[PDB]
């Protein structure tokens with residue numbers, strides 16, 4: 221196979237604070253052009269076959285269907301007088317929402333998204349029940365877009381209502397307790413397309429209030445910031461449903477603004493812009509509403525608390541030099557989330573060395589009452605509200621699909637018991653072993669990393685290791701269950717390894733801030749030192765190492781291949797960011813500037829320019845050295861991270877590095893149709909994806925298959 225001829229527009233010179241930089245494939249930024257679509261068809265025209273010629277691709281796909289064909293369950297959660305839970309019988313495209321009148325009664329289907337699209341590309345995204353639990357609202361995203369459409373249903377007898385709301389994106393959903401309507405966000409009718417294939421930027425998001433039974437055209441706009449195109453304010457009601465807490469965001473940082481409105485002070489209902497009272501009118505800290513008792517509101521904050529803590533604010537006595545610390549910041553443990561339950565019970569879930577821990581405190585004083593026992597892993601689900609008298613929480617780990625626990629908090633002795641549990645026949649945990657080491661980075665900083673391998677393997681660098689990482693946006697990559705990665709471990713004798721490099725939140729905002737802006741390069745160094753570790757201690761070798769990542773992840777893997785291509789022999793970047801110069805001009809990109817910086821700033825341009833994947837591709841100077849096999853994966857409806865990044869990055873690779881004679885390794889790309897950034901991808905498509913990713917690896921590193 222030969223790489224297709226791509227037209228280079230050498231006249232595309234733009235001036236960044238003096239420096240002149242060329243973008244000969246800037247024409248790839250037009251999704252609807254004939255040239256772009258020819259480029260796309262042409263690339264998939266050489267990748268599809270390639271991927272299909274590997275026989276393992278069928279062995280993998282077959283083992284995937286089987287092993288992934290197990291009952292996936294969500295936590296039961298009570299709304300009103302009925303119970304609810306999502307459930308997938310095994311290989312169903314999208315999870316279904318079942319309902320029951322009693323934890324012991326038979327349960328029926330309440331919402332089956334599977335009947336709205338022959339191929340599972342229409343998916344539920346976001347949902348909100350009325351306070352009474354008698355009305356349901358849900359948004360559905362087509363083809364993977366972020367764009368959503370909210371419909372309404374009457375819980376009793378599952379009735380469809382004529383209500384429909386369009387042009388919704390990154391919106392909240394809050395029902396007033398009077399059950400009259402719902403708060404939501406929508407954008408201004410922009411010229412062009414609005415289905416997820418466009419790249420137009422998103423600004424001027426407003427807060428509107430839909431009154432059930434009316435046309436969207438009659439909705440009440442409740443808040444807008446016309447002087448600030450980027451601010452995005454979500455709303456929600458206090459537990460007593462008297463206050464509306466509006467959280468104003470600008471960028472992806474864990475900081476917001478807290479404005480409130482005493483519903484009981486509105487001259488006569490919600491008739492327009494609200495009389496917002498500006499409590500926290502600055503972006504210096506995160507304020508997360510937990511619950512409130514009267515005017516006393518309790519919020520999870522990080523204000524002078526890198527690891528987060530708890531505070532009480534009386535709205536009558538707002539002055540900061542008065543807030544009362546309920547639960548002080550833990551010197552080393554990070555406070556992930558807090559939930560109020562059974563009125564005065566508080567459930568906090570900490571992150572102790574990238575491991576979740578579940579405790580239970582007293583809202584009144586904050587004293588610790590109980591510790592819920594969990595193995596090493598992650599708590600992935602929870603269900604317990606102020607009015608509930610019971611909790612439900614899901615536990616997952618590298619080797620455990622999941623365990624749902626239950627707990628009746630009305631009992632004197634708080635003893636929790638297994639509610640639901642599920643094992644994946646075909647796999648035997650006792651055969652694998654999880655270890656967590658701490659390796660040092662280029663600067664001394666000890667970085668954590670988990671490693672799953674079979675028991676008994678001899679460290680002689682003879683195994684193919686899959687190294688994963690993300691690094692950024694305060695996201696913490698904790699222990700999860702991936703059948704698709706285990707198969708790799710047992711059917712290709714591979715070594716799984718996940719690194720928690722700086723930029724993430726595993727260690728408060730100081731871990732987040734140590735891998736962003738002027739220190740972004742700290743994650744690439746952090747993630748490189750991980751390959752060097754696995755390789756040094758004989759887990760694997762350079763030619764048999766694979767590094768995956770997507771979104772912020774994919775940028776990481778793409779930059780590490782550009783900086784140290786001699787370290788890995790395979791790279792798989794999914795829907796990643798590649799153009800660090802023009803990234804902020806698309807869809808919601810402007811919100812990422814808080815982690816990367818802005819090419820618009822003479823000072824930010826210098827950090828970016830040095831690592832921007834698309835602008836640092838180079839032919840290795842050493843004779844015996846070449847680029848690792850690379851597979852970029854992206855879809856046409858990814859409006860989160862528009863395809864132009866990968867599209868442009870691939871044209872560049874095949875040209876600069878691809879066309880030389882010493883480069884035997886492949887530089888392929890695969891553009892999926894009817895799929896977006898990742899969320900909501902139907903099962904079928906999911907399976908198909910991993911089969912490629914791993915087939916590619918097998919053909920590239922020449923890996924045999926182990927029955």
Ligand SMILES: O=C([C@@H]1CC(F)(F)CN1C(=O)CCN1C(=O)c2ccccc2C1=O)N1CCCC1
Pocket residue numbers: 390391392452454469471472693695771772797808811812860861
């Ligand atoms: O998608 C993203 C970044 C980093 C993230 F944290 F993962 C999520 N993200 C965001 O861009 C998230 C965008 N986003 C908001 O800012 C927001 C405000 C209120 C409600 C809903 C939303 C929402 O989806 N990226 C892809 C490339 C790297 C960053």
